[PDB]
């Protein structure tokens, strides 16, 4: 636990880096018990540019941006999404990726924000997804879950009426379990920018981070990967 500047990772060699490992495809453990996704396939590839072992630290999401002030790891990357409220808490990097929320409910279940009056709602705590939930007017309940595929699980029980969630997660989680005939894709709630995440006041790794993932997006790697995990270029655009 400390606070290390990017030259003190870089004489030890190694760099600890904090995701969670249950949000596929972005970061997660694969069926092999491996940690994977687009974000641990980009983290890889800054530690390499940067000439640094990563260290992988797998953490409920809640815990890892208060974790990470702690000096538990050097870094998070885990789908976090720049609000006003966390840009305070730790120092973003510049977007890794672009993206928004967005309504998934079964077949003939509620498509927009306005359809959710009445209704029961699941999200993964601490999310921008439960803080859309909360200010959208009417709903029932908004049910709270540790993990995010928990939420999809209960819309599949019909538990819950709807899951608000990434729309790759949602898209990818459709293919992968063969859903397209029992759930659809809703309306575009909001859209984010995703961003790696350091100390507070780390401006040492900050740079070195926001350096690596320039070079990344000029050299053809950042597009590699992006291609690799969703035949498109999600890039902040
Ligand atoms: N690894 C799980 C992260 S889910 C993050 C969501 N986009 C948010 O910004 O709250």
Same mark, same amino acid.
């Given at each position: #636990?400390?606070?290390?500047? $990017?030259? +003190?990772?870089?004489?030890?060699? &190694?760099?600890?880096?904090?995701? !969670?490992?249950?949000?596929?495809? #972005?970061?997660? #453990?694969? +069926?092999?018990?491996?940690?994977?996704? $687009?974000?641990?396939?980009?983290?890889?590839?800054?530690?390499?540019?940067?000439?640094?072992?990563?260290?992988?630290?797998?953490?409920? $999401?809640?815990?890892?941006?208060?974790?990470?002030?702690?000096?538990? $790891?050097? #870094?998070?990357?885990?789908?976090?999404?720049?609000? !006003?409220?966390?840009?305070? /808490?730790?120092? %973003?990097?510049?977007?890794?990726?672009?993206?928004?929320?967005?309504?998934?409910?079964?077949?003939?279940?509620?498509?927009? @924000?306005?359809?959710?009056?009445?209704?029961?709602?699941?999200?993964?705590?601490?999310?921008?997804?439960?803080?859309? @939930?909360?200010?959208?007017?009417?709903?029932?309940?908004?049910?709270?879950?540790?993990?995010?595929?928990? @939420?999809?699980?209960?819309?599949?029980?019909?538990?819950?009426?709807?899951?608000?969630?990434?729309? %790759?997660?949602?898209? +990818?989680?459709?293919? +992968?379990?063969?859903?397209?005939?029992?759930?659809?894709?809703?309306?575009?709630? %909001?859209?984010?920018?995703?961003?790696?995440?350091?100390?507070?006041?780390?401006?040492?790794?900050?740079?070195?981070?926001?350096? /690596?993932?320039?070079?990344?997006?000029?050299?053809?790697?950042?597009?590699?990967?992006?291609?690799?995990? %969703?035949? &498109?270029?999600?890039?902040?655009?």
């Amino acid at each position: #636990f400390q606070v290390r500047s $990017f030259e +003190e990772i870089k004489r030890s060699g &190694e760099i600890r880096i904090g995701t !969670e490992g249950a949000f596929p495809p #972005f970061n997660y #453990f694969d +069926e092999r018990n491996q940690l994977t996704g $687009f974000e641990v396939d980009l983290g890889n590839a800054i530690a390499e540019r940067l000439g640094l072992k990563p260290r992988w630290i797998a953490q409920s $999401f809640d815990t890892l941006l208060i974790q990470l002030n702690q000096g538990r $790891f050097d #870094f998070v990357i885990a789908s976090h999404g720049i609000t !006003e409220e966390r840009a305070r /808490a730790v120092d %973003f990097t510049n977007p890794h990726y672009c993206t928004g929320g967005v309504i998934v409910s079964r077949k003939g279940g509620p498509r927009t @924000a306005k359809d959710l009056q009445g209704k029961v709602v699941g999200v993964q705590v601490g999310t921008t997804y439960m803080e859309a @939930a909360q200010k959208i007017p009417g709903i029932k309940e908004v049910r709270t879950y540790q993990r995010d595929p928990d @939420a999809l699980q209960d819309l599949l029980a019909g538990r819950i009426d709807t899951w608000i969630t990434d729309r %790759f997660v949602a898209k +990818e989680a459709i293919k +992968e379990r063969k859903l397209e005939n029992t759930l659809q894709v809703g309306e575009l709630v %909001f859209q984010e920018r995703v961003a790696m995440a350091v100390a507070k006041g780390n401006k040492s790794l900050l740079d070195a981070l926001n350096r /690596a993932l320039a070079e990344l997006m000029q050299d053809g790697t950042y597009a590699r990967i992006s291609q690799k995990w %969703f035949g &498109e270029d999600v890039r902040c655009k």
